[PDB]
Design an enzyme around this catalytic site. Structure first.
Site, PDB file in Angstrom:
ATOM      1  N   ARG A  22      67.040  50.136  47.761  1.00 33.81           N
ATOM      2  CA  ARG A  22      68.196  50.935  47.325  1.00 33.81           C
ATOM      3  C   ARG A  22      69.544  50.215  47.513  1.00 33.81           C
ATOM      4  O   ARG A  22      69.773  49.546  48.530  1.00 33.81           O
ATOM      5  CB  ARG A  22      68.238  52.239  48.103  1.00 33.81           C
ATOM      6  CG  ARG A  22      68.800  53.453  47.378  1.00 33.81           C
ATOM      7  CD  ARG A  22      67.778  54.634  47.571  1.00 33.81           C
ATOM      8  NE  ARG A  22      66.378  54.385  47.129  1.00 33.81           N
ATOM      9  CZ  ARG A  22      65.511  55.341  46.782  1.00 33.81           C
ATOM     10  NH1 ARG A  22      65.845  56.608  46.781  1.00 33.81           N
ATOM     11  NH2 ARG A  22      64.283  55.078  46.464  1.00 33.81           N
ATOM     12  N   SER A 116      66.506  58.303  44.034  1.00 33.32           N
ATOM     13  CA  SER A 116      66.172  59.691  44.384  1.00 33.32           C
ATOM     14  C   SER A 116      67.421  60.557  44.506  1.00 33.32           C
ATOM     15  O   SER A 116      68.294  60.390  43.648  1.00 33.32           O
ATOM     16  CB  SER A 116      65.310  59.763  45.704  1.00 33.32           C
ATOM     17  OG  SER A 116      64.720  61.019  46.057  1.00 33.32           O
ATOM     18  N   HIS A 117      67.663  61.474  45.436  1.00 36.95           N
ATOM     19  CA  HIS A 117      68.925  62.233  45.491  1.00 36.95           C
ATOM     20  C   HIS A 117      70.305  61.504  45.509  1.00 36.95           C
ATOM     21  O   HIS A 117      71.397  62.096  45.509  1.00 36.95           O
ATOM     22  CB  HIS A 117      68.827  63.133  46.700  1.00 36.95           C
ATOM     23  CG  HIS A 117      69.325  62.488  47.997  1.00 36.95           C
ATOM     24  ND1 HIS A 117      68.619  61.925  48.965  1.00 36.95           N
ATOM     25  CD2 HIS A 117      70.664  62.445  48.350  1.00 36.95           C
ATOM     26  CE1 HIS A 117      69.502  61.573  49.863  1.00 36.95           C
ATOM     27  NE2 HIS A 117      70.726  61.902  49.489  1.00 36.95           N
ATOM     28  N   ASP A 287      65.771  67.642  42.802  1.00 41.55           N
ATOM     29  CA  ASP A 287      66.593  66.453  43.002  1.00 41.55           C
ATOM     30  C   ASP A 287      66.337  65.461  41.856  1.00 41.55           C
ATOM     31  O   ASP A 287      65.552  65.739  40.937  1.00 41.55           O
ATOM     32  CB  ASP A 287      66.275  65.810  44.353  1.00 41.55           C
ATOM     33  CG  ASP A 287      64.954  65.049  44.370  1.00 41.55           C
ATOM     34  OD1 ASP A 287      64.143  65.146  43.374  1.00 41.55           O
ATOM     35  OD2 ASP A 287      64.656  64.312  45.384  1.00 41.55           O
ATOM     36  N   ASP A 289      64.686  62.504  41.135  1.00 37.29           N
ATOM     37  CA  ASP A 289      63.348  62.134  40.613  1.00 37.29           C
ATOM     38  C   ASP A 289      62.338  63.310  40.671  1.00 37.29           C
ATOM     39  O   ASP A 289      61.163  63.153  40.305  1.00 37.29           O
ATOM     40  CB  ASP A 289      62.804  60.905  41.361  1.00 37.29           C
ATOM     41  CG  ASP A 289      62.592  61.087  42.863  1.00 37.29           C
ATOM     42  OD1 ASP A 289      63.172  62.045  43.496  1.00 37.29           O
ATOM     43  OD2 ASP A 289      61.824  60.269  43.499  1.00 37.29           O
ATOM     44  N   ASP A 291      60.922  65.296  43.265  1.00 34.00           N
ATOM     45  CA  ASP A 291      59.767  65.382  44.184  1.00 34.00           C
ATOM     46  C   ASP A 291      60.221  66.180  45.436  1.00 34.00           C
ATOM     47  O   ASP A 291      59.592  66.118  46.500  1.00 34.00           O
ATOM     48  CB  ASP A 291      59.207  63.960  44.481  1.00 34.00           C
ATOM     49  CG  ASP A 291      59.772  63.232  45.708  1.00 34.00           C
ATOM     50  OD1 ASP A 291      61.032  63.122  45.880  1.00 34.00           O
ATOM     51  OD2 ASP A 291      58.973  62.707  46.575  1.00 34.00           O
ATOM     52  N   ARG A 292      61.316  66.923  45.209  1.00 38.14           N
ATOM     53  CA  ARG A 292      61.983  67.810  46.211  1.00 38.14           C
ATOM     54  C   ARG A 292      62.271  69.177  45.563  1.00 38.14           C
ATOM     55  O   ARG A 292      62.430  69.288  44.342  1.00 38.14           O
ATOM     56  CB  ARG A 292      63.308  67.194  46.629  1.00 38.14           C
ATOM     57  CG  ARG A 292      63.196  66.312  47.860  1.00 38.14           C
ATOM     58  CD  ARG A 292      64.252  66.641  48.906  1.00 38.14           C
ATOM     59  NE  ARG A 292      64.892  65.450  49.466  1.00 38.14           N
ATOM     60  CZ  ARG A 292      66.191  65.378  49.771  1.00 38.14           C
ATOM     61  NH1 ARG A 292      66.944  66.353  49.525  1.00 38.14           N
ATOM     62  NH2 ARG A 292      66.599  64.266  50.324  1.00 38.14           N
ATOM     63  N   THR A 356      59.140  61.655  60.029  1.00 36.23           N
ATOM     64  CA  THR A 356      59.664  61.897  58.698  1.00 36.23           C
ATOM     65  C   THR A 356      59.280  60.818  57.683  1.00 36.23           C
ATOM     66  O   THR A 356      59.422  59.601  57.909  1.00 36.23           O
ATOM     67  CB  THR A 356      61.197  62.041  58.781  1.00 36.23           C
ATOM     68  OG1 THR A 356      61.438  63.096  59.726  1.00 36.23           O
ATOM     69  CG2 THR A 356      61.863  62.428  57.462  1.00 36.23           C
ATOM     70  N   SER A 377      63.219  68.778  54.782  1.00 34.67           N
ATOM     71  CA  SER A 377      64.134  68.096  53.853  1.00 34.67           C
ATOM     72  C   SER A 377      63.873  68.433  52.376  1.00 34.67           C
ATOM     73  O   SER A 377      63.970  67.588  51.471  1.00 34.67           O
ATOM     74  CB  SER A 377      63.977  66.603  54.038  1.00 34.67           C
ATOM     75  OG  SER A 377      62.636  66.240  53.697  1.00 34.67           O
ATOM     76  N   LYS A 388      55.616  63.503  46.837  1.00 35.36           N
ATOM     77  CA  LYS A 388      55.772  64.960  46.778  1.00 35.36           C
ATOM     78  C   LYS A 388      55.900  65.483  45.340  1.00 35.36           C
ATOM     79  O   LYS A 388      55.875  64.698  44.383  1.00 35.36           O
ATOM     80  CB  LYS A 388      56.980  65.434  47.522  1.00 35.36           C
ATOM     81  CG  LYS A 388      56.799  65.709  49.009  1.00 35.36           C
ATOM     82  CD  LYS A 388      57.761  64.830  49.819  1.00 35.36           C
ATOM     83  CE  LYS A 388      59.213  64.851  49.311  1.00 35.36           C
ATOM     84  NZ  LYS A 388      59.651  63.523  48.911  1.00 35.36           N
TER      85      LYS A 388
END
Length: 561
Positions: A22, A116-117, A287, A289, A291-292, A356, A377, A388
């Site tokens: 990232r 992601s987010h 979010d 991608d 997966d949340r 986590t 989360s 996820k």
């Protein structure tokens, strides 16, 4: 097309994390050969003889710079010997979709392009997330080999000339110089294999009746202009027959519409004010991608991610997939509440507490020890894939609503009255000055490990907090054998009330102090009131045992989740 080699000067900072490399967009577009080099490093972890019979799945959440980055993956994968690439149409492919396709078509691995987010756009983030043959994220062993190579690279292989069309579905074949096999690109619809998988998991008929029929559950899905957009429109609107207006912000925007794709009350405020009025019965958001997931009941009724995995666990058989497959294990990350454990205990099904991050989950799911799992989360998932799944948690929720014919709020009152309520909140105390935090954990460790620490009664206003246990949590992975030490400071009081401290520090900016509070309750009367009132003594107690302001000066949390 021709295979030409580019000479390159290697890099010091390309260390891939548990969620891939990232970096803010600027690093990628302004740094000569940054991307080119990382892609060639990923590809180089794949051993030469396996390159020809191989298919990598490529695709991303849709943020800015996704496209020529994919165009880079293509030319490097092609010169490099990769036989075939299965890219979602227009580059779009959600993270749960890319795991599902890898697993399905028995691919070597995928290359998800998602930060992601974290926001997207010219001055927002970007990132190359590598997943492997089981559909999950590359393990440490593989991520660091990518690191050893990114740092020492001299030259990368490329086909400059090659340019596929991302809009056109179907197979494209190209001929590479002095190569007896053609390079095949294949454009797949973005939603189809994913919805096909969902079709055998859930009872789409029961659902179609629920979203279309006379009783019509009036749902509201916001996709924050991220990758789930297409998938929401296709599966919920077209196939399940959800009124077109049910899908909000479902069109992939490069900068996610100038905003943060984080599904939490703060960031997804828009959906929450719309949910406050009372028209809608169900609401949900995702979010970047996807997966949340954030679940919401009538008027805004926030279903806490912790309580949520516990409700889907307390009604798991309402789902066709669990009835034919069986539930071979439950799981959560340690900072996440004890609501899933009050459900898991009631059954002789295993429960795992873990650090986590997905790999922990992933490893048990591969060891056939876990079926349903969650995080605080805003994360929920199952062994159907190996990452996820946002949309799968919303559909499991709609399947419970369909079977149950009760509102979301009643589902929680029934849950808390049979199981008891684990009150939960989270205090994000952003970036502090290094020296205090480190001390406070140490004094607290010295305090917590004491001969007279345990058995002692703590109090303020209502409940008596008798310390039954204390430690600084570490994990021994049952599958790859790793030991993740010092994961969080733990405070355990006999009734079930806990306080977890997680210090995400940086020898770069400063250090984050995370205050997690799980406060259990079983009284018929005490349960239905607000969590900030019910957790307040235990919140100050956390400050009086750690002596929080005393070595930091911090009064309030930057974010309450």
């Amino acid at each position: 097309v021709k295979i030409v080699t580019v000479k390159t000067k290697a890099y010091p900072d390309q260390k891939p994390g548990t969620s891939g490399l990232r970096k803010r967009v600027k690093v990628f577009q302004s740094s000569t050969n940054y991307a080119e080099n990382f892609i060639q490093s990923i590809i180089s972890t794949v051993e030469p003889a396996q390159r020809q019979e191989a298919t990598l799945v490529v695709g991303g959440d849709g943020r800015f710079y996704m496209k020529e980055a994919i165009q880079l993956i293509v030319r490097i994968a092609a010169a490099n010997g990769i036989g075939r690439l299965v890219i979602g149409q227009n580059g779009i492919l959600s993270t749960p979709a890319v795991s599902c396709i890898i697993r399905k078509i028995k691919a070597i691995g995928g290359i998800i392009l998602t930060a992601s987010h974290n926001p997207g756009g010219p001055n927002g983030d970007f990132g190359i997330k590598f997943n492997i043959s089981n559909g999950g994220p590359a393990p440490e062993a593989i991520t660091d080999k990518i690191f050893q190579i990114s740092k020492t690279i001299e030259e990368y292989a490329i086909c400059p000339d090659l340019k596929v069309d991302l809009g056109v579905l179907g197979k494209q074949q190209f001929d590479l110089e002095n190569k007896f096999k053609p390079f095949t690109v294949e454009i797949v619809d973005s939603v189809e294999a994913y919805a096909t998988m969902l079709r055998n998991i859930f009872d789409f008929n029961a659902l179609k009746e629920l979203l279309s029929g006379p009783n019509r559950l009036k749902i509201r899905i916001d996709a924050m202009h991220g990758v789930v957009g297409p998938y929401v429109k296709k599966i919920l609107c077209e196939e399940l027959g959800a009124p077109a207006n049910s899908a909000v912000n479902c069109v992939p925007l490069e900068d996610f519409g100038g905003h943060h794709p984080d599904p939490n009350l703060t960031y997804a405020a828009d959906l929450v004010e719309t949910m406050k009025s009372g028209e809608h019965d169900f609401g949900a958001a995702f979010d970047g991608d996807g997966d949340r997931n954030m679940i919401l009941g009538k008027h805004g009724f926030f279903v806490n991610p912790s309580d949520s995995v516990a409700v889907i666990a307390a009604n798991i058989f309402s789902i066709p997939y669990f009835q034919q497959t069986g539930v071979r294990g439950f799981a959560r990350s340690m900072p996440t509440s004890g609501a899933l454990d009050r459900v898991a205990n009631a059954t002789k099904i295993a429960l795992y507490e873990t650090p986590t991050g997905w790999k922990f989950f992933g490893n048990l799911m591969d060891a056939s020890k876990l079926s349903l799992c969650g995080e605080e989360s805003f994360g929920t998932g199952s062994d159907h894939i190996r990452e996820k799944d946002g949309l799968w948690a919303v559909l499991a929720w709609l399947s419970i609503l369909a079977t149950r014919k009760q509102s979301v709020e009643d589902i929680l009152k029934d849950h808390w009255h049979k199981f008891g309520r684990n009150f939960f909140t989270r205090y994000d105390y952003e970036e502090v000055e290094a020296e205090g935090a480190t001390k406070m954990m140490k004094d607290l460790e010295a305090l917590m490990f004491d001969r007279s620490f345990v058995g002692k009664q703590f109090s303020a206003n209502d409940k008596v907090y008798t310390v039954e246990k204390a430690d600084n949590f570490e994990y021994h992975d049952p599958v790859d054998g790793s030991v993740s030490k010092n994961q969080g400071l733990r405070l355990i009081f006999a009734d079930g009330s806990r306080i977890i401290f997680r210090l995400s520090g940086t020898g770069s900016a400063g250090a984050t102090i995370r205050l997690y509070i799980d406060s259990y309750e079983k009284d018929n009367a005490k349960i239905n009131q607000d969590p900030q009132v019910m957790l307040a003594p235990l919140i100050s107690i956390a400050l009086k045992v750690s002596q929080l302001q005393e070595r930091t000066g911090r009064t309030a949390p930057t974010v309450i989740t």
